[PDB]
Structure 1
Amino acid sequence: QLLEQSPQFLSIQEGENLTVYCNSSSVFSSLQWYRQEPGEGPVLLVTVVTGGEVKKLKRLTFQFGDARKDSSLHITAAQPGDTGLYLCAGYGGGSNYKLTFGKGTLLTVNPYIQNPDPAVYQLRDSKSSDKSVCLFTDFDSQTNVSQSKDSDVYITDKCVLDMRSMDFKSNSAVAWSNKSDFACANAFNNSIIPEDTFFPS
């Protein structure tokens, strides 16, 4: 009644291949793979029943070991649309008819950024000049945005937007606070960012 999936989290660059794993100590009647987008129902990818089978669905390859306890999911040439939670679930096993999920591999496939221009900008409230946010933007895909150690400072994770008419993508993260010390120069200091990150006055 326990399925371990590794890795728990996986960030991959567009175009790389990758493998995620599902191992249990229980013997199941079948193992079943799903992909889930956030707050949406999981969608079935495939079921494996026969020890040792290999199922290929386009760039996705599923394997079920001969001993029937291990399964892997391999993806060729990862695309940003592959992003999602990849779930394995075990059905049955001779005692009962439960269908038990592992905790998934949350796969994030980061898009190639052609021309990074890392920068931190200050933006002011349309209604209230004295209220502002800091925007870290245009950093490359491998940049990792960390949380603050100050609980008075909120920092989002990075998000990619696509300006379709300009065929342009860009990453950004947002930080905000109430404190007096809060300057956009320092907002993202818990992150390891490029030395050439642009800080306007």
Structure 2
Amino acid sequence: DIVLNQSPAIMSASPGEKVTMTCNSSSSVSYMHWYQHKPGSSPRLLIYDTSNLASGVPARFSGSGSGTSYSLTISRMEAEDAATYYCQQRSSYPLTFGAGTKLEITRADAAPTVSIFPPSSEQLTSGGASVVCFLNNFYPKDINVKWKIDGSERQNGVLNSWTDQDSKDSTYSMSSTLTLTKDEYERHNSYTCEATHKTSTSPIVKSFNRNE
């Protein structure tokens, strides 16, 4: 299985901007296909045999390459070009794919709206306790969440998940869940979700007191 290395793994561009991504091969290949894949639909053949556009594909897309290095270029990015792009070699069996370059849309930096939620009575009744923090509609994607209980950071038992880039406003959102035992939960008062981001000099702090 020939290994194909796509770079960058993820990138962002403003509409109108020129975009280039690369597919480098551990071995020589004679041709390369490219596919476009958007959430909500299945892969679409974009270029075949290195540089030929598939049916329906706009001339802003072009492909080039030879030997061990191949590339895909959009002369002028449209918003509808946000997608994951995969290269595929066709010179050795099995046919193999790169891991994808996710092409995102650049928008203006946006600070997160942060909300923190205590465990439900339903969950406490069953012996567990999860504290949830939502960090909604921010840009860029990189963000850090810190959980503090009674002033001391907790790093274990935290599950985080990011949404895909929003189709309407191009922001991201992220959810963080810290799960505790009910007994440890009932032994502490102060629960804090702390967010750091390009848009804050100090952390955004949301908190609740179990005694209130």
The two structures share one fold, judged by TM-score above 0.5: yes
Post-superposition offset of 1:20: 1.0
- Verify the 8 A CA contact 2:4 2:24 in the aligned structure 1: yes
Which one of 150, 157, 160 corresponds to residue 155 of structure 1? 160
Q: List runs of 5+ in structure 2 lacking aligned partners.
A: 125-129, 147-153, 208-212
1:11-22 alignment to 2 at 5 Å?
11-15=11-15, 16-22=17-23
Partners of 1:26 and 1:8 in 2: CA distance: 19
2:83 matched residue in structure 1: 84
Q: List runs of 5+ in structure 1 lacking aligned partners.
A: none
Post-superposition offset of 1:21: 1.1
| Aligned structure 1 segments of 4 or more residues deviating by more than 6 angstroms | none
Partners of 2:22 and 2:145 in 1: CA distance: 28
Paired-residue identity, %: 21
TM-score (norm 2): 0.64
Partners of 1:98 and 1:159 in 2: CA distance: 31
Partners of 2:120 and 2:60 in 1: CA distance: 47
Number of residue pairs matched by the alignment: 184
1:2-151 alignment to 2 at 5 Å?
2-15=2-15, 16-37=17-38, 41-48=42-49, 57-65=58-66, 68-92=67-91, 98-105=94-101, 107-113=102-108, 116-123=110-117, 128=122, 132-139=131-138, 141-146=139-144, 150-151=155-156
- Judging changes above 3 Å, is the alpha-carbon distance between structure 1 residues 152 and 81 closer, same or farther for their aligned structure 2 residues? farther
Bigger Rg over Cα: 2
Which one of 178, 188, 191 corresponds to residue 183 of structure 1? 191
- Judging changes above 3 Å, is the alpha-carbon distance between structure 1 residues 89 and 81 closer, same or farther for their aligned structure 2 residues? same
